[PDB]
Design a protein around this ligand. Structure first.
Ligand SMILES: N[C@H](CCC(=O)N[C@@H](CS)C(=O)NCC(=O)O)C(=O)O
Ligand SMILES: N[C@H](CCC(=O)N[C@@H](CS)C(=O)NCC(=O)O)C(=O)O
Lengths: 208, 208
């Protein structure tokens, strides 16, 4: 396959797909569309929303895939990153759901005036986000190994770090001197996946 | 197992779990907590949020499961309702993600004054919801069989009908004389699963 991941110039909903490919050691083309260009390109993407993944073989030819975490789960399943037992699969999905709930809170701050955004940010960071972080902590403590689920990288690990990055977008100091399990998880992940370590260190800085 | 599904007296986030058990032919206890009682019960549920599923064997004894769609996916996997091939698994997850996006829009109307709720409802039903329904329609048309993914019931079918029910909560007339693929899907599902047909006909009416 030639794999092309098409998204805006940000982490956003595409980051789980990028990280999955990176962790699995799969080469892909990272196609990033400027907001100025999007209205021109939107008519050409099946469904008209991003991310979309265009997969080209050489036999038939083009296949389009939509729906970010459907794509990520499929790729993760192909590469043995959705758990090794049914119980691990549940644990992966549980942490994904918890992480997605944090993402839902973060999403409230997007496209808001630089005044209301500050109000929403304070509300979610002093309200639901700490509650979800406590659940995430409990989920991590429940692991049988050094990563989110056992000792092998799963999609849960990647979803988790992507959402934590959105939290630190809102408040760079949110985890400073706090949440040792979250820090340890990231350290353990980076030690476990040099491909991901390299990718994260070379990743362009984006606002979302 | 004795399985107890614990939720508020509504469909909400528990409905995917209930429907999965029903479709799979698994008996469970449906424990519904009144809002008046919740502050009293909240301290006793691991994580303090619903739904939670309490599973009792007779050997060890109690296991708690959290995170609605993690629970639903695990139960669906155990009962061969997550697709028969990797490509079907992707299709299941794709329709789940699309359906969940409709649910996200619906969620905006909850706990709002009976004036702003009417304003949000109009906005989402004339905006993003029709766009998502078109995607859902395309996903259904893509099926190799009579249901959402092939000819066998999957978790995608159940998530889909649960979210459509939330749409018709907002506007009872939203699908009247429209969206023939959505109607056909429901008819096909009910013909395919007499257990679900019976369950839906006997289900108590709830506001969410
Ligand atoms: N369920 C989603 C939603 C994708 C989505 O909401 N895409 C947005 C950007 S993250 C978009 O393409 N909006 C621009 C537009 O619709 O014109 C997914 O995760 O793939
Ligand atoms: N990711 C969720 C969230 C569960 C959730 O938001 N629960 C709400 C009701 S749907 C709740 O228990 N709120 C009452 C409270 O937190 O005190 C799941 O699907 O299980």
């Amino acid at each position: 396959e030639h794999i092309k991941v098409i998204y805006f110039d940000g982490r956003g909903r595409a980051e789980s797909i990028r990280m999955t490919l990176v962790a699995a050691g799969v080469d892909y083309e990272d196609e990033r569309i400027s907001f100025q260009d999007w209205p021109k390109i939107k008519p050409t993407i099946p469904g008209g929303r991003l991310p979309a993944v265009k997969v080209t073989d050489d036999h038939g030819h083009v296949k389009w895939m939509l729906e970010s975490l459907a794509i990520a789960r499929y790729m993760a399943k192909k590469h043995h990153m959705m758990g090794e037992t049914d119980e691990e699969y549940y644990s992966v999905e549980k942490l994904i759901g918890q992480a997605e709930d944090v993402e839902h809170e973060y999403h409230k701050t997007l496209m808001k005036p630089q005044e209301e955004k500050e109000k929403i940010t304070k509300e979610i960071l002093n309200g639901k986000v700490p509650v979800l972080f406590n659940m995430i902590c409990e989920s991590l403590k429940g692991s049988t190994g050094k990563l989110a689920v056992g000792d092998k990288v799963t999609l849960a690990d990647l979803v988790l770090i992507a959402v934590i990055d959105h939290v630190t977008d809102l408040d760079k100091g949110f985890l400073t001197g706090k949440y040792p399990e979250i820090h340890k998880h990231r350290e353990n992940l980076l030690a476990s996946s040099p491909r991901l370590a390299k990718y994260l260190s070379n990743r362009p800085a984006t606002p979302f």
